[PDB]
């Protein structure tokens, strides 16, 4: 198979996934498409820090588990999103600094990975640690202010919390090979591999739009990262305007890189998108397949 995105991807040993929102699981038209077309699931919001540890030292896994349980009951693997992030921090964590913040970050990783131990294919361990200011450096977050080694520490912590999970660094605007942000990440990952820091994968969010357009040098990005000795994944794909050719291009970029694990689109239907006005996904609000759907499917079936 052949007739659905997930099955097409699996012929080449890859997955095609989607972001699932827990609020939409009571929507039958939504779950019909999602169950049929995808073999990988990411929780859109339910596995973030404020979702899982909204109070200090007390974990809340209900919504996360609702997504996880739906995925597993419908034959999907799951990517965890996300363990350590400057954004969406609960009030109690935002207040913390230094060694106390560092320990909270560690304890969060242990609690969330511990709960899902063995159940999660890939974790976005660190998310969005690089600046968009053009310097190619780290954000000045509370996390970064604990010390530059925070990311390395997060990764070593996560390895011990669930040895079976692939550990991913996830970011956006790191797809264009010529961008400073891209190079800053490439240089961190290279350093990590030289020093034996346990990163298994780099996730390329792949939000393509007018402020961050697709460039054919994406394949070069993927190839260069892969050659460092990591896997690569496309984690949050959407394309402003949903051009068929751009969707096919992105697909063929992944298919061209053997260490490209698969592609996750960030939503099922245009209506489900964080950018619904951009109609950037593979299905319309009424559940019909867009032209891009066919382009992606043909590319996956084309090997």
Q: Which domains does the chain have, with CATH numbers?
A: 1-303 (3.20.20.80)
CB 17 within 8 A of CB 42: yes
Q: Which of 44, 152, 175, 236 is catalytic?
A: 236
Does 236 participate in catalysis according to the annotation?
A: yes
Q: What is the DSSP letter of 128?
A: -
**At what resolution in Å was this solved?**
2.1
Method: X-ray
Tokens read off for 15: 């997955």
Count of residues making up the chain:
303
Q: What is the DSSP letter of 273?
A: S
Residues forming a β-bridge with 209: 212
Q: Which of 22, 15, 74, 73 is nearest to 44 (CA)?
A: 22
The dihedral region occupied by 154, where left means phi > 0, alpha psi between -120 and 50, and beta the remainder, is alpha
Q: Which of 209, 188, 208, 199 is nearest to 156 (CA)?
A: 199
């Amino acid at each position: 198979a052949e007739s659905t995105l997930g099955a097409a991807a699996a012929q080449s040993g890859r997955y095609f996934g989607t972001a699932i929102a827990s609020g939409k699981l009571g929507d039958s038209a939504y779950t019909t498409i999602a169950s049929r077309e995808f073999n990988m699931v990411t929780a859109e919001n339910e596995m973030k820090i404020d979702a899982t540890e909204p109070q200090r030292g007390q974990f809340n896994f209900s919504a996360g588990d609702r997504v996880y349980n739906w995925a597993v009951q419908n034959g999907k693997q799951v990517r965890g999103h996300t363990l350590a992030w400057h954004s969406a921090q609960p009030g109690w964590m935002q207040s913390l600094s230094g060694s106390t913040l560092r320990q909270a970050m560690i304890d969060h990783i242990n609690g969330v990975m511990g709960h899902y131990k063995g159940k999660i294919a890939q974790w976005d361990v660190v998310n969005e640690a690089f600046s968009d200011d053009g310097s190619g450096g780290r954000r000045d977050s509370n996390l970064q202010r604990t010390g530059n080694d925070w990311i390395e520490v997060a990764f070593r912590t996560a390895r011990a919390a669930d040895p079976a999970a692939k550990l991913c660094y996830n970011d956006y605007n790191i797809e264009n090979w010529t961008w400073a942000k891209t190079q800053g990440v490439y240089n961190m990952v290279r350093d990590f591999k030289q020093r034996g820091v346990p990163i298994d994968c780099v996730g390329f969010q792949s939000h393509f739009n007018s402020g961050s357009p697709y460039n054919s040098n994406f394949r070069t990005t993927l190839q260069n990262f892969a050659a460092l000795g990591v896997d690569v994944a496309i984690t949050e794909l959407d394309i402003q305007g949903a051009s068929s050719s751009t969707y096919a291009a992105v697909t063929n970029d992944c298919l061209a890189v053997s260490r490209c694990l698969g592609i996750t689109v960030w939503g099922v239907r245009d209506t489900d998108s964080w950018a619904s006005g951009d109609t950037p996904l593979l299905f319309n609000g009424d559940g019909s397949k867009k032209a891009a759907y066919t382009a992606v499917l043909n590319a996956l079936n084309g090997g």
